[PDB]
Design a protein around this ligand. Structure first.
Ligand SMILES: [Cl-]
Lengths: 34, 34, 34
């Protein structure tokens, strides 16, 4: 159950990273515009 | 095996994070320049 | 003893992600400020 809990947490982390990557791409578009 | 799978994923995640760290720094550099 | 290693790494990654998220937030604030 402890290992499963860590797996669950790692999933949230990967999900967060994906969101971060999206934000970086969006911010780069803003920089490209200016 | 599950512990090993988590450990493998952490290597990849840490690799992504280091790349993100550089992207964030680049964004700040560019924002300051323009 | 077989899990502590990935636990330490997960905690570390969580802090890294939290720090990056705050950075992006401030960056977005800077954008919304302009
Ligand atoms: Cl993790």
């Amino acid at each position: 159950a402890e290992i499963a809990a860590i797996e669950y947490e790692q999933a949230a982390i990967k999900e967060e990273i994906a969101a971060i990557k999206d934000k970086i791409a969006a911010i780069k578009e803003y920089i490209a515009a200016i | 095996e599950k512990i090993a799978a988590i450990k493998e994923e952490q290597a990849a995640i840490e690799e992504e994070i280091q790349a993100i760290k550089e992207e964030i720094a680049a964004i700040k550099y560019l924002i300051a320049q323009i | 003893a077989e899990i502590a290693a990935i636990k330490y790494k997960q905690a570390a990654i969580k802090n890294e992600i939290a720090a990056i998220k705050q950075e992006i937030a401030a960056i977005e604030q800077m954008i919304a400020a302009i």
